[PDB]
User: Fold Caspase-1 from Homo sapiens.
Amino acid sequence: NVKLCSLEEAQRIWSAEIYPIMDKSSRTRLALIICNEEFDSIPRRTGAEVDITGMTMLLQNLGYSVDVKKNLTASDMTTELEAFAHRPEHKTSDSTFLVFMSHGIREGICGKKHSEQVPDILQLNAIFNMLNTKNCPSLKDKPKVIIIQACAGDSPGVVWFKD
Amino acid sequence: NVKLCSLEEAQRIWSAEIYPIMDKSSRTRLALIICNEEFDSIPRRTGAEVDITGMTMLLQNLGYSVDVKKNLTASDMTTELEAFAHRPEHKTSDSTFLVFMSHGIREGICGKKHSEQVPDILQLNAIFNMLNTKNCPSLKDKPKVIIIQACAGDSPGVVWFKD
Amino acid sequence: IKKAHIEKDFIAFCSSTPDNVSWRHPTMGSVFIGRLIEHMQEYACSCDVEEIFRKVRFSFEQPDGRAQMPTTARVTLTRCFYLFPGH
Amino acid sequence: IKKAHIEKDFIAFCSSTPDNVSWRHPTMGSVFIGRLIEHMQEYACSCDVEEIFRKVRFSFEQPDGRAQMPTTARVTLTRCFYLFPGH
Assistant:
């Protein structure tokens, strides 16, 4: 589904300001999609399957082995992220993608059990921490792309004007 | 002090994915530098004058009228930012630069009276808010560049490894 | 022992600005995700991810109907990240 | 009345990553500021600000001595911002 970079296009791009790409035959690229659709106290995220399909197909076609996890608390998300960061395939990888899709608030991403009374939130800060050089040494010097589909609060994010 | 963009260079760059530049003769570009050097409870930021000089000269040579404010509390910084956002010159400007130079912590930029006991902090959130489309309508659709020289916490920001 | 940066080579791309809503059609999917796939499909061949993400942001420029503005956050990419699709 | 995005066309460039120190020589000035001036001086003519800022980040790549990593934050630039120095 992705337009291909031709040999003359890759040569045109290639100098020392580009992340090195590993040999196609030996590399083990990994990506993770966490998507919450069903919640304890928030309406079902209908249409999430369309998102899961599109992102999985795209990332696979970009060369990534894609793992999909569904309907998790912030704690389970944390465990999953910890397991993902420790995967030995990252050592023979050149990059990674992390996709989070859920309800969201200003504080962060909503776990399946989130409520205004009892918060269940994965912070953006925690995501970075779990994938940094200390906790994920295998991705040191390698691009880590984090994609988030969620609200960052409940404001429509607009201002009105006459003129 | 800035290498000039030649006529053939500007033509090479010029299509619809670039911020429009206003006519040199009619435009009134503004920039603001806030630099704290002297503090109530933190050691003097020696060498700050070198920073002030360099940034002022650079921004002037890029075409900006530069205002410099020194040794302010978070409240005074706020008032200054509010006054800056309301300046009518922005209507006949195409862009702006905001430079903040101070001691810093994770929460934000330190005012002159900051202490662990009594915090005096300008949040990054507040800076954006004061310069957004509601509070600074004259810079709607125009690039706003914020430059911060400060600590974002007290960690050296490193991890050690054997191999 | 040797020193290394604790945080480097990160980029985050969020569906909306802080405080603000992101939109999702009940059958068509999330607008940001749909827009992201389409731009990655078209531009991964010729643009680095930062450039692609900027192109996604441009597509939301006009605040028509259900307005939102995707944001790039906490960027420590030291080089350009090209996907080199096909390679 | 008409709608407009509350937050758009912003870029922030910070001297270090969250939690982390930035460095300043007592007579030579702040390293990030010095590095920023030098890169703006050289590259404003040919690179947009996002590209310049990435180049600044690259220069800190090796965590030699007093390590720090400048960060681009909260980016809603929808287009490339070229300074066009001289124009």
Observations:
- DSSP finds four helices and eight strands in chain B.
- The longest helix of chain B spans residues 48-61.
